[PDB]
Amino acid sequence: SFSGYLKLTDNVYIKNADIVEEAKKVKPTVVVNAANVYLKHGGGVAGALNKATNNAMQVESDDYIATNGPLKVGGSCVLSGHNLAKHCLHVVGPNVNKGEDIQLLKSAYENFNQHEVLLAPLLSAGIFGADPIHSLRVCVDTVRTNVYLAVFDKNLYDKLVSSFL
Numbered sequence: 001s002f003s004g005y006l007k008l009t010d011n012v013y014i015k016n017a018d019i020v021e022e023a024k025k026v027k028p029t030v031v032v033n034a035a036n037v038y039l040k041h042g043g044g045v046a047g048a049l050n051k052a053t054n055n056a057m058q059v060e061s062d063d064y065i066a067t068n069g070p071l072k073v074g075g076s077c078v079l080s081g082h083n084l085a086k087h088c089l090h091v092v093g094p095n096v097n098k099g100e101d102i103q104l105l106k107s108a109y110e111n112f113n114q115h116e117v118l119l120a121p122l123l124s125a126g127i128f129g130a131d132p133i134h135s136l137r138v139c140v141d142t143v144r145t146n147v148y149l150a151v152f153d154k155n156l157y158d159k160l161v162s163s164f165l
């Protein structure tokens with residue numbers, strides 16, 4: 001079970017933690033991946049989660065894309081969680097470094113509402129280029145299910161908690 005999380009709202013919790021280490025420890029029903037439309041898990045959270053599965057997440061993802069085609073920005077798919085979780089919810093937040101609509105961030109967070117509890121990163125944060133303070137605000141105003149946010153960066157975690165309205 002989840003431990004050491006700071007409660008932000010009725011249903012949103014946050015911790016300064018590596019989401020791979022958090023997943024390996026808790027083994028949640030759902031771990032969220034910060035995916036791209038192609039499910040190419042190269043860097044950031046996706047690269048780290050895939051490397052922890054010994055590339056099994058990428059192999060499974062390539063078969064999914066070969067069958068179904070790419071996801072939509074703001075969309076998701078449920079795949080195996082491998083050694084990290086029962087399931088991985090691959091969610092595509094807009095990548096502002098690729099010029100994608102930041103307004104799609106709320107649609108991306110709506111995917112979390114189909115799962116009662118999730119371990120997740122902040123969508124569109126990190127290498128996706130959005131303001132993590134904005135991502136946390138969209139998260140608390142969109143997600144109604146129980147979300148345990150893992151923020152890798154200590155200095156960003158402190159800034160997020162200290163600025164939370």
Ligand SMILES: NCc1cnc2ccccc2c1
Pocket residue numbers: 018019020044045048126152
């Ligand atoms: N310790 C593996 C690792 C590497 N890179 C990361 C990037 C974002 C979030 C968590 C990460 C975890």
